[PDB]
């Protein structure tokens, strides 16, 4: 409701139909182990922001017991509950598109057979700042083509949710495990990518700071790992 | 009422995925058996055809049995005195099997590579099941394959559909005969998951979402203002 | 002349009454709809013949308010050229202050001038909150109603 406690973590939130369960499939086994809220560093949505992109499970790779079990076990299988909250007054306008893209293969900014380096396809808690400059070996950051050559308007076929600061300030997207294999290596392959894209730009009133924090809180749910490293050899 | 919009029917139609050209001539003093076009192998790549690539990449995953129709037609643009009656071996190399390097290799008589022997002018037809390693093919792969090192980000061997190799079983005549082979793939028992955005920009690579630089805007401009109908 | 996020944003302006906000025809194979998910899959086939689901979304501040009047001109007719002709036809007077998202079902067409028009006019001027001046934006959405058919599949080239 407003004191959702998951593990030793607790967040305060608002919902009436806020959870977007992706493709109407709740995450389920093929909690109570690594299921807690991991609250990423708040991004600053300024007036000239282009967007942010976090890879999952790569955004949670240093996050405590989850990131420990991610590198301890080879194979894993996790769903997610992603809360994106952009707290504001009733004077801010603007609109975020919080979208979850399964298998978001990125495009390099050099074209041809040039591929994106592991430094940039796995950026961690920092994510990809889409308003920054293209670095050598990084992805293309042109937000109109969704970093993959497909237009930004057609990004609503993926499980998405708007944060219209006029209407709400939170977006919850309940991600299941989406892959073509039943279990996979969590360290070399990103299942989904969370993107938070300002479509309508942030307008502040005169007398307000032209910036606004965005908090992403990812709770991994129904997280499984491989039976090896605890399976007996007898 | 909407049976044309099924993915069994939208993705399931015979497109031209490969057109190769092999020749019937002697290998006497022939070094390279590909520059001579004595044979041609082709890694089965449905994303080589950008009309079928743009339809397959409307989905994240796709699982289909395959269906290959092979049309071989001859041609003799030299002095010939007769049109020869030729037989083509259309050999399906499965995923993980070795490809031919010569037209008289051991691979052509390998029993585990299924091969079709058919006449030129006639047509071949066979079906290959789902030979992927995942439970579906990956139109898009956000990550690396099999390795912790650099593995090209989306280039994965899970999407290996096999290989088709083509030679003429016949020996040479005194004239050169040019057989052009057209492979027609039809995805059957198609099922697809996670619909994606349609691709607006053209392609630069296979297996990569890279679009060309300084390309043209896909959203086309009005002839007036936003109020102009 | 380039593709950008600003092309999805329908600009609204203060101190404009009885002007037009936007206006488009409803050929969903050309124009604004050619690159949408509807119009990329419509242009794989030849004949569509269904109802459309047209939405708008007001993204300006919670204190701003305006009345926009959302005219549907059916096919065969002329699109309106003042706010009053829009009101005398099929419309919604949509109060931006109250309803932040409007959903309008375009009637069954078989549209393949023609296909219909769709315009938006300022009923009232845009009232902005104090010392918050400039432009606010609309986001427009298109989809298909579940009676939408699609037949005689064809091939786009490049």
């Amino acid at each position: 409701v407003q004191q959702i406690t998951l593990g030793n973590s607790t967040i305060t939130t608002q919902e009436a139909a806020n959870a977007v369960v992706c493709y109407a499939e709740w995450p389920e086994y093929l909690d109570t182990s690594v299921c807690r809220f991991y609250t990423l560093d708040s991004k600053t949505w300024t007036t000239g922001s282009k967007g942010w992109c976090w890879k999952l499970p790569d955004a949670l790779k240093d996050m405590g017991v989850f990131g420990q079990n991610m590198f301890f076990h080879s194979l894993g299988r996790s769903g997610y509950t992603v809360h994106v909250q952009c707290n504001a007054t009733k004077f801010h306008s603007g609109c975020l598109l919080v979208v979850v893209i399964p298998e978001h293969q990125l495009a390099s900014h050099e074209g041809g057979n040039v591929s994106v380096k592991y430094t940039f396809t796995h950026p961690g808690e920092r994510g990809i700042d889409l308003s920054s400059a293209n670095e050598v070996g990084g992805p293309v950051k042109d937000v109109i083509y969704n970093m993959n050559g497909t237009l930004l308007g057609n990004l609503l076929i993926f499980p998405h949710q708007f944060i219209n600061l006029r209407t709400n300030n939170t977006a919850t997207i309940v991600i299941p495990y989406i892959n073509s294999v039943p279990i996979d290596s969590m360290t070399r392959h990103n299942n989904v990518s969370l993107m938070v894209i300002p479509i309508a730009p942030l307008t502040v009133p005169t007398g307000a700071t032209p910036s606004l924090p965005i908090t992403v809180t990812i709770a991994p749910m129904c997280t499984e790992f491989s039976g090896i490293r605890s399976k007996s050899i007898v | 009422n909407g049976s044309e919009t099924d993915v069994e029917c939208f993705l399931g139609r015979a497109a031209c995925v490969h057109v190769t050209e092999i020749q019937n001539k002697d290998a006497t003093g022939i070094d390279n058996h590909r520059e001579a076009k004595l044979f041609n192998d082709w890694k089965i790549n449905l994303s080589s055809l950008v009309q079928l690539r743009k339809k397959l990449e409307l989905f994240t995953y796709v699982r289909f049995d395959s269906e290959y129709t092979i049309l071989a037609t001859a041609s003799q643009p030299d002095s010939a005195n007769y049109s020869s009656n030729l037989v083509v071996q259309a050999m399906y190399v499965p995923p993980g099997a070795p490809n031919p390097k010569e037209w008289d290799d051991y691979t052509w008589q390998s029993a585990s590579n299924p091969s079709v022997f058919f006449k030129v002018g006639d047509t071949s037809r066979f079906s290959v099941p789902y030979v992927g390693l995942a439970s579906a093919y990956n139109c898009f792969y956000d990550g690396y394959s099999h390795d912790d090192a650099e593995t090209q980000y989306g280039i994965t061997v899970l999407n290996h559909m096999g290989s088709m190799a083509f030679r003429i079983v016949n020996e040479h005549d005194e004239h050169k005969t040019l057989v052009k082979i057209r492979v027609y793939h039809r995805a059957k028992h198609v099922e697809a998951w996670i619909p994606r955005a349609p691709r607006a920009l053209p392609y630069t690579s296979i297996g990569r979402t890279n679009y060309p630089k300084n390309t043209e805007p896909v959203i086309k401009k009005r002839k007036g203002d936003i109020k102009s109908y | 002349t380039k593709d950008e996020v600003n092309s999805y944003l329908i600009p609204l302006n203060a101190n404009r009454q009885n002007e037009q906000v936007f206006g488009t025809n409803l050929f969903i194979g050309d124009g604004v709809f050619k690159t949408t998910l509807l119009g990329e899959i419509v242009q794989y086939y030849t004949h569509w013949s269904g109802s459309l689901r047209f939405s708008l979304m007001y993204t300006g501040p919670a204190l701003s308010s305006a009345k926009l009047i959302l005219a549907y001109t059916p096919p065969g007719a002329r699109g309106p050229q003042d706010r009053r002709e829009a009101m005398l036809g099929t419309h919604v007077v949509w109060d931006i202050g109250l309803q932040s998202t409007i959903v309008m079902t375009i009637p069954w067409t078989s549209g393949v001038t023609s296909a219909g028009f769709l315009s938006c006019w300022y009923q009232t001027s845009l009232i902005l909150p104090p010392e918050t001046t400039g432009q606010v934006y609309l986001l427009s959405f298109i989809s298909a109603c579940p009676d939408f058919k699609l037949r005689l599949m064809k091939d786009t080239q490049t």
Partner: antibody
Amino acid sequence: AVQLAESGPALVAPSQALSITCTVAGFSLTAYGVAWVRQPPGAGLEWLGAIWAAGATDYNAALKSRASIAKDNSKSQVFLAMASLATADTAAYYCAREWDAYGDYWGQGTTVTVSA
Amino acid sequence: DIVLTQSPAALSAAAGATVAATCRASGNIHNALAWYQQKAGKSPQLLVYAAAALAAGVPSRFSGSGSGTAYALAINSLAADDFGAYYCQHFWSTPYTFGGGTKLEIK
């Protein structure tokens, strides 16, 4: 063709009014608005105001009191009037069409000098 | 009000040099800027609208850039026709104020 022919008396004593008009040939004032921009010689361009495509007008912050803009929709004429004229009003006055709410199709402009 | 400060005031360059006029606003224009070109005794003509989009009848030598408050007008490989006074105008919040102006002269 979209053309906006400026027309003014151009010889006006100060502390008087202005009847400097723009006949609109090519488009309609009900579907587009007209922006007014003056430029004194030596100094740069200065916005005066814009009557919108249906009635509404905007002005300079310093010239809300002096300037006033109306239009005739049938005769396609746009009217600019100013009160309490000074020597700083010696300027070529221009009309425009509002293209994407910007300003273009500027006429050649009538140089209107306020003199004794 | 949004006040445009167009720096510099005048530039001396040859036909082929790169000219980068600059406008910086007090408020945030949100890329709703228009650049103008004017000759001696001629009407101003529109070069760049929306701070990046070249207008109709504008060559590809002109290139609008910049976002937010600061906006550059980079002109590459000048010709003989491209000498004159250049004025910004923002079209965001009514009033639509101009900038100061950059004139081009030959070295």
